[PDB]
Design a protein around this ligand. Structure first.
Ligand SMILES: [Ca+2]
Length: 742
């Protein structure tokens, strides 16, 4: 539990003891007492009567004799009374996590009224014991331990090859912390399981076990938790959502002693074994998620997957009241919550098990139908790929042959490898896509036919078509918006990610029917065999991906007709059309620029920018201002140069920010041609200083995209809104900055 464990021998063999608190006597695990003859017998209520003994054992090598009782558990529950010389100390592991930053970040990113927010701040110190305070700190379920030596045919010990030593240091800490708490034991065994390293985002390495041999030895004879698609249709959607990360909760369940060998692995020649459920093993995920779902069966609105728990309510009092019941259940069960990834009391939870943030209030989530604009090719190979991509539409889009003539009129005309795109060609590409998005080329879902899904993927996005089985038009397309990490996946993994995404929206359209999936992969047998140096996706991904092959209402098929897409340009997303309120953010950055005639004939011009940091929380308040003289530059470059400054000053703000511009050019260009200018390389602008001014709002939005940019005219504006006050302030500053001369 949460006292330092204590290392001991009884009869030759070593074992762990946990300091006790009750007035009960010292329980020994039941298999040591078997040969010992009983002293008296005595009825324990919490009235099962039991034999009592008097035995000798060691604690830190020193000998103890004690009046003891039998325990079905794996450890010694040690009475403080029996050991008056030793004192109880708390658990000491290697690296103390920054629980304070974690808690501050969660109190920050919260939609709770500061009233309940303050009640959460008291809850963080109410069951502080149920929070992960140390790295590698595991919990301890006091449950009946599991037996995974099922199936009589043993697996065959896999040899352990050498691995990267540059990872051994950060992995040894883990090994030593999981020994100290008894999660590993040093037990030479008949099985050897292979081990590999994978890099962690922080620059350390985390260890992976390749259990694919053991797993074919044991059967999935167990009531599996509902799968991703089962959970995502059932979930309640109400105002306040919350997700909690069990820190490797499967490590909390123990396994029987006769099972330790099965889990064995070698690390620096010494062959260790697991006291607890291992990650990789066939039945871990379902046994742990089973127990979780039992523990929260009384809670109205809860969904669990792997170790991620999501709970949501409408009434902010009832949310935190239910959440305390959960904290109690998890504490008394021995579980351990990690607040680094956890998200409490938020109107949008960044992920509820799968890769999809939750928002608003319906029982089912609801995603954007239409796909996004592709950017222009930079190459012949990039043009041929998109051609071969659109080729399927000839048969159901009447205005295709014409639309596409100009693009082909681009293959042979500039027959010199690289071609040339006019700006009107990009307008024709957008016209192409809009056709496919018009409701006359979209079929309707037919409950008699089966539901067909055609899946491919570029490097930038996944491409998904939905058809009816015999249909000639697609019900709806669906493009995929890869997360920052999803981008790091290999190709085939991009295809499988996209499959999970597509099947979540699909679980709505099938409406009691079957689903057929067509893809460029020849088998769903050969792919489980893909070697682990190639899997660039966490095996949580590969698991969630392969849970779908146990569903009878889903079949996978190889479509030879599909085009090779490893040469599609970038998709052009947009933070545009979601223009939102003026005041609901966490900060507002007004911007302006002026330029006037120059006093020295040589410079010819003279510009100044202006910037305002205001927050519109309870009411308008100004946090800082700025009036910066720029030199001889375009007035439009003052208005441009001001938003770069306020974007850079925003990276310091963990939250949503708003940036206001007088300049239609900047405010539109930062919405319509910026995603384009990026995938162009700033070619044929403008000498060099001009180009080195646009790139930096690019890079600054890349790093933080939760920053929006609006526009306004603002001429002769008396009080045209509540919003123009700030932009008059900012126009005063940029004009002030203009008049000053160096
Ligand atoms: Ca102006």
């Amino acid at each position: 539990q949460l006292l330092q464990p204590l290392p001991a021998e009884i009869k030759g063999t070593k074992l762990l003891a946990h300091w006790a608190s009750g007035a009960t006597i010292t329980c020994i695990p039941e298999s040591f007492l078997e040969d010992e003859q009983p002293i008296k017998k005595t009825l324990i209520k919490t009235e099962k009567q039991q034999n009592v003994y008097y035995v000798t054992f060691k604690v830190k090598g020193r000998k103890v004799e004690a009046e003891v009782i039998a325990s079905p558990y794996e450890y010694i529950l040690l009475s403080p009374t029996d050991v008056p010389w030793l004192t109880q100390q708390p658990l000491q592991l290697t690296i103390l996590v920054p629980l304070q930053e974690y808690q501050e970040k969660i109190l920050s990113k919260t939609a709770l009224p500061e009233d309940q927010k303050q009640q959460l701040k008291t809850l963080f110190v109410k069951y502080d014991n149920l929070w992960q305070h140390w790295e590698n700190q595991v919990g301890h379920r006091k449950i009946r331990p599991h037996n995974i030596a099922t199936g009589d045919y043993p697996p065959r010990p896999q040899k352990q090859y050498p691995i990267n030593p540059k990872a051994k240091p950060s992995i040894q800490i883990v090994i030593d912390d999981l020994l100290k708490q008894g999660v590993l034991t040093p037990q030479n065994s008949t099985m050897n399981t292979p081990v590999y390293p994978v890099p962690k985002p922080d620059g350390r390495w985390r260890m992976v076990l390749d259990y694919r041999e053991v797993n074919k030895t044991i059967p999935l004879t167990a009531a599996q938790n509902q799968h991703s698609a089962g959970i995502l249709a059932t979930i309640v959607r109400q105002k306040y959502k919350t997700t909690l990360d069990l820190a490797n909760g499967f490590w909390a369940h123990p396994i029987t002693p006769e099972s330790y060998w099965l889990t064995a692995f070698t690390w620096q020649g010494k062959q260790y074994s697991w006291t607890r459920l291992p990650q990789g093993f066939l039945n871990s995920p379902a046994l742990f998620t089973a127990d979780v779902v039992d523990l929260l069966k009384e809670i109205p609105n809860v969904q669990v997957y792997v170790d991620d728990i999501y709970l949501s309510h409408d009434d902010p009092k009832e949310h935190v009241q239910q959440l305390e019941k959960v904290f109690q259940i998890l504490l008394q069960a021995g579980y351990v919550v990690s607040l680094k990834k956890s998200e409490i009391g938020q109107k949008t939870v960044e992920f509820l098990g799968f890769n999809i943030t939750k928002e608003g209030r319906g029982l089912t989530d609801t995603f954007k139908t239409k796909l996004l604009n592709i950017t222009p090719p930079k190459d012949l190979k990039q043009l041929q790929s998109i051609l071969g991509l659109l080729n399927f539409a000839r048969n159901f889009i009447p205005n295709f042959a014409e639309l596409v003539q100009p693009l082909y009129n681009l293959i042979a005309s500039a027959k010199g490898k690289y071609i040339e795109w006019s700006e009107e060609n990009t307008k024709q590409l957008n016209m192409v896509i809009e056709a496919l998005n018009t409701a006359s080329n979209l079929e309707e879902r037919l409950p008699e036919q089966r539901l067909v899904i055609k899946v491919n993927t570029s490097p930038s996005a996944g491409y998904v078509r939905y058809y009816n089985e015999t249909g000639k038009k697609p019900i709806m397309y669906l493009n995929y918006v890869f997360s920052k990490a999803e981008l790091k996946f290999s190709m085939l993994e991009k295809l499988l990610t996209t499959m999970d995404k597509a099947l979540i929206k699909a679980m709505d359209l099938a409406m009691g029917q079957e689903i057929l999936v067509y893809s460029p992969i020849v088998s769903m047998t050969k792919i489980q065999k893909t070697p682990l140096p190639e899997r660039k996706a966490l095996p949580i991904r590969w698991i969630t991906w392969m849970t779908y092959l146990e569903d009878p209402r889903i079949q996978f098929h190889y479509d030879k007709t599909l085009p090779e897409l490893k040469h599609i340009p970038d998709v052009y997303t947009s933070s545009q059309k979601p223009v939102k309120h003026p005041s609901q953010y966490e900060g507002v950055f007004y911007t302006d620029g002026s330029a006037i005639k120059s006093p020295d004939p040589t410079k010819s011009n003279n510009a100044g920018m202006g910037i305002v940091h205001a927050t519109y929380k309870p009411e308008y308040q100004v946090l800082n201002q700025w009036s910066i003289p720029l030199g001889n530059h375009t007035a439009q470059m003052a208005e441009i140069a001001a938003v770069e400054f306020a974007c850079k000053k925003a990276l310091k703000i963990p939250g949503p920010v708003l940036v206001i511009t007088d300049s239609f050019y900047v405010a539109e260009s930062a919405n319509k041609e910026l995603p384009y200018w990026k995938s162009n390389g700033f070619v044929n602008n403008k000498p060099l200083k001009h180009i080195s001014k646009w790139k930096s709002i690019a890079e600054c939005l890349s790093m933080k995209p939760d920053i929006t940019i609006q526009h306004e005219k603002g001429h002769q504006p008396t009080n045209t809104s509540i919003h123009t006050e700030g932009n008059a302030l900012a126009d005063k500053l940029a004009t002030q900055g203009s008049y000053v001369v160096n």
